[PDB]
Amino acid sequence: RAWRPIAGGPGPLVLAVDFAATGRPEAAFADLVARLDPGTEVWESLQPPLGTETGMVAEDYVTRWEEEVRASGRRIGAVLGFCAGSAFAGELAVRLARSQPRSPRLVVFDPESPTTSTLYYQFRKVVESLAGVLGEQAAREALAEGTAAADRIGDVEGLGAELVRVFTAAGRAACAAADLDDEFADELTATYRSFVSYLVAAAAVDHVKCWSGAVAVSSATPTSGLNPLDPAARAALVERELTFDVHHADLLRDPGVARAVARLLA
């Protein structure tokens, strides 16, 4: 299955696209849907079973999500995405505008098309967050190799593949230097692999095309979402941009965000 219901309803459906990962710093769509209008039915995107995302490009990710919606027979009233998930949200919304008589609304939250920079920064934060499970040695070497990779590999797909190599090697080193359990380590390295696969495929989406009709919801974190862009570039990229004085990591749990989103969906 490619979708998980996270809030019930009678009615048109809301899809929410994100990489589900307990332990990340950022609030999640569960935090937003808790604060939306009751009766809003919401499904959250599931990743392919661990390992089966090997061999999937962006087209395959989107078709997998889209075919399950087609099979369900349900109509989609809105597609939400957060961060890199906004890329896939936009593509699904464009495809549903073509397959449905009436187009869904598209709302993207701090939308990002992954770059070598965002990939590398997220890699560093994953490693730091897991320094205790990996041990100081495997974590130190992972950062050293990842920095070297970021210095030498200029493209997103290639950097992602190398960072996954590095992280996999760190997990395997932790099982033989820091006493990390072997099945927890396979899960850890497989989950990071799935995350990078998702990010690299998200980067392949034509985000200029698919965000042209999006309403963007923006935090105040200057490195997040549309915030690094020139003002004229932001206005050209999306149809509308609402701003909120909250951190990126709090955006989806903020009551003001939820109030505005409920009105966008009404």
Ligand X SMILES: *[C@@H]1C(=O)N[C@@](O)(CC/C=C\C/C=C/C)[C@H]1O
Our finding on whether 228 is near ligand X (CB under 6 A) is no
Our finding on whether 247 is near ligand X (CB under 6 A) is no
CB of 12 to ligand X, least distance (A): 26
The rounded Cα 234 to chain-centroid distance in angstroms is 20
Mask 79-98, x = binds ligand X (CB under 6 A)?
----xx--------------
Q: Which of residues 106-125 bind ligand X (CB under 6 A)?
A: 112, 122, 125
Separation CA 230–CA 107 (nearest Å): 21
Report residue 243 as tokens: 């701003």
Report residue 129 as tokens: 């967050």
Separation CA 157–CA 117 (nearest Å): 12
Our finding on whether 126 is near ligand X (CB under 6 A) is yes
* Among the residue ranges 17-25, 57-65, 151-159, 164-172, the one whose residues contact ligand X (CB under 6 A): 17-25
CB of 55 to ligand X, least distance (A): 22
* Among the residue ranges 21-29, 38-46, 132-140, 152-160, the one whose residues contact ligand X (CB under 6 A): 21-29
Which of 20, 24, 35, 262 contacts ligand X by CB under 6 A? 24
- What residue type is assigned to position 85 of the chain? G
Q: How far is CA 220 from CA 110, 112, 128, in A?
A: 10, 14, 24
Residue 3's SS3 state is strand
94, HSE (Cβ side, Cα atoms, 13 Å): 18
Residue linked to tokens 């332990």 = 23
Which of 5, 8, 11, 25 contacts ligand X by CB under 6 A? 25
**Which residues here bind ligand X, judged by CB under 6 A?**
19, 24-26, 83-84, 112, 122, 125-126, 129
